[model samples]
Target chain A: GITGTWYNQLGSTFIVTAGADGALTGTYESAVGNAEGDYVLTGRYDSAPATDGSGTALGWTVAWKNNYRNAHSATTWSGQYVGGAEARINTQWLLTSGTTEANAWKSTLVGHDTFTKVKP
Target chain B: GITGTWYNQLGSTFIVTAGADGALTGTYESAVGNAEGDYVLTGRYDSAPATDGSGTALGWTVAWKNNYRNAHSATTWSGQYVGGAEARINTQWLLTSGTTEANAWKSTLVGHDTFTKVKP
Candidate 1:
């Protein structure tokens, strides 16, 4: 069901591809943050017609490369696809960077958003 | 130099740990985002006198576990440490969902921030 491109509130874009075996993968391109490049992503999906959608359940991960600090960090997302006159994906994400030790709570970030099909 | 907790502009916190071998790891706790939990991170650092600091070049990644939509996504950060009476990390980040395709571009979120040692 999440086998296409999506637009985010953060002003970025990503593309996803799914397999009948519940396999998922894609590429991410952001217009704003530390890195200005395309990052690869991977995940899985469930192809069940639980609703009007198949593989409504989805999950994925990405390791960011090509950044300013040249330092490495990563993030992950979890969400579901809702089908309708306009399809959308509801998601939540976690961002992590261990630049500091345990006392620094700035290491992790959390947030939520919705994705809709980007059509011309 | 970057071996402690940090505070971010996003109102979040993270803890980092490093070894003499340039190994990096930490936990991220975001007051926002889809997740409201602690996520573990792992990476490496350069243990050389790149300056008065050792293992300054840092990088890491995390897989978010607790989130709403039950969907999965991720992000990455790359940065550098500026040592001073109050040290800080200047970083750039890339957030990717890949729920869509390259046309979406919204799949990825990119931004930058500075992390300072969190002190009461």
Candidate 2:
């Protein structure tokens, strides 16, 4: 399950809890965007395996609310969970404009990253 | 193929060009973060399909280098292209940190989104 806390490649934080039938809900503090840090994050995980038998598929979304510079925008991250020594979530994502041209400049960007658990 | 302008759900922008053996290079201006807008984006599209025959898979990445509050973070977005009445790239993603706890609060966030083409 996608429970507990994790740090990411971009200098941010994610405190997550699995509930509501595998619903991975949590709070995220992003170190990248102009939006306020510590925003509610919402996503889901699958009961079945996304890769290894012990692995599962999960994803999350964050609405960049209270954005100061650009105003309205949202980002989504999707990927799967793999467990073992170095349990992690590797995913793909996109940032989109809520209000703009059907498509606009500097609006849509795509990339990927991994979130490994913090065991201590 | 993933070359042009696109707007997203959160009010950002992406202007891309295909090169370097299916390399989908582009620039993304995020409407959410504190970092400067108009950052170079880098990703790729598979020569093959990720879904339907004509559908292709692609991805990109951005480094939030000059983040004011927090620094040293990178994000990635990955997904596929679907052509039809509304040509778009639907994807999954994650934002992570380069500092802090192995896993920290508000650092790792996940979600998904789709980017549709903007035509004049």
Candidate 3:
């Protein structure tokens, strides 16, 4: 049910396309100094009726490898659609591993990049 | 000039084998549930005279892709050899990015894993 672009509170962006079979692929753009380069993401999502009978909720996971640099990350998100026009996911950005950045500056992984759906 | 096992204060371990041409290959074992699986490491080290003419100080970088899970990390370390028998590196573990673990639990990366040479 989540098939669109998501912009995080921290200026990061995710352009995702969901598949009917619970698979997904997309591109991730980080803030200027967030990490290094944009990433190509691939993963899956599963939606189920909420235990409280509150319609539906979803659990999703995705992994990304850098498109231009030597870095990668995997994240998990959970939430549901709102008003049939918005999708929100509580994101937990896991550890990121990589060396230096494009400028030869030291590259270190930093985290807690939670996001919100911006466009459908 | 570094060929041995290192133990970080956090209980992680690294078993390294260095090449004469500055190339290095090794294994990185994270402490307990660090991120995901142990990693296979590869990279290089360069030795140079200390800026203060104190002796020799070295700068090195290494990267590791997971051996069993979808995770990886890269790092840089610099320091000097002590007493001709001990080598120490002030290590800075960069961002690590990966998905879930073998148990399907949420996998997150945590760092600042500076290491000290313990065996040769």
Candidate 4:
């Protein structure tokens, strides 16, 4: 049932999943695949009670794996409704790797959000 | 005469500078411009022998400001030579921002590189 676009906060992760003529009922995850390495994030989907192929209201429950330091492991950071065209979430965070001790430290990432269509 | 491209260990920062039929003589920096925010990185150039526009071997001297936590500041993390093509250095780093504490957290960046033609 759940079908649409989903985005992760901080522009760092994303996942697209679909259900069989019903709301979400499974798990999903993907890699960040950046310089820091591979950080996988997981997600669960939920859809509004609508008929197959009907314009159903969609939602998602997302999460992911954590880091080795345990300082900041991967997890479901953010989830919300999506609009037309491509969906995106732009948030702020700290940069914590492969930098110096005297240089300005902070950067951004282009999160890999995805879209899914309702099942007929 | 300095003329060519430069790259950092991690694909996060770069700087391009040229001098009067020489190698390098200054500092330059730019933002990571990703999701976290803006991790600023700096660089310096060291040109190869020859004279100005001459087919000379070029090099560079690069550095940047560190972070606030004193943990991982954006400094001259990596520096190397130039060959052919658009010139590039593909290194790896850690992801320390904008991630959950349960999911995997690793990613990479497309460093901003530049080219310089020796001055005549």
Best by lDDT: 2
Evaluated at residue B22, the lDDT of candidate 1 is 48
Docking class of 2: incorrect
What is the DockQ (computed on Cα atoms) for candidate 4? 0.08
Quote each prediction's TM-score: 0.48, 0.49, 0.38, 0.23
Global local distance difference test of model 3: 0.54
| Candidate 2 to truth, TM | 0.49
Candidate 3: residue A47 lDDT (0-100): 46
Question: Against the true structure, whose DockQ is highest?
Answer: 4
Segments of candidate 1 deviating more than 4 angstroms: A52-55, A67-71, A102-104, B1-120
TM-score of chain B of each: 0.81, 0.81, 0.59, 0.30
Model 4, span A1-120: residue lDDT tens: 134333343233233445554344343333343224234433333344334533334443332233432322222323334433443332222223333433323332223333333211
lDDT of 4 by residue, B46-113 (tens): 44444443333333332222342232223232333444444433222323333345433333222323
Which sequence of candidate numbers ranks them by DockQ, best first? 4, 2, 1, 3
lDDT of 3 at A49: 41
Q: In candidate 2, how many clashes are counted?
A: 70
For DockQ, candidate 1 versus 2, the one ahead is: 2
Note the Cα lDDT for every prediction shown.
0.58, 0.72, 0.54, 0.35
Name model 2 segments beyond 4 Å from true.
A50-54, A66-70, A102-106, B1-120
Clashing pairs in 3: A95-B96, A95-B109, A96-B95, A96-B96, A96-B97, A97-B95, A97-B96, A97-B97, A109-B95
On the 0 to 100 scale, the lDDT of residue B8 in model 1 is 83
Output the worst ten-in-a-row residue range by lDDT, candidate 1 chain B.
B48-57
lDDT of 2 at B18: 78
Candidate 1's residue-wise lDDT over B15-101, tens digit each?
988666445667777666666777655544444423323214344444344332322444455555657787877665555443433
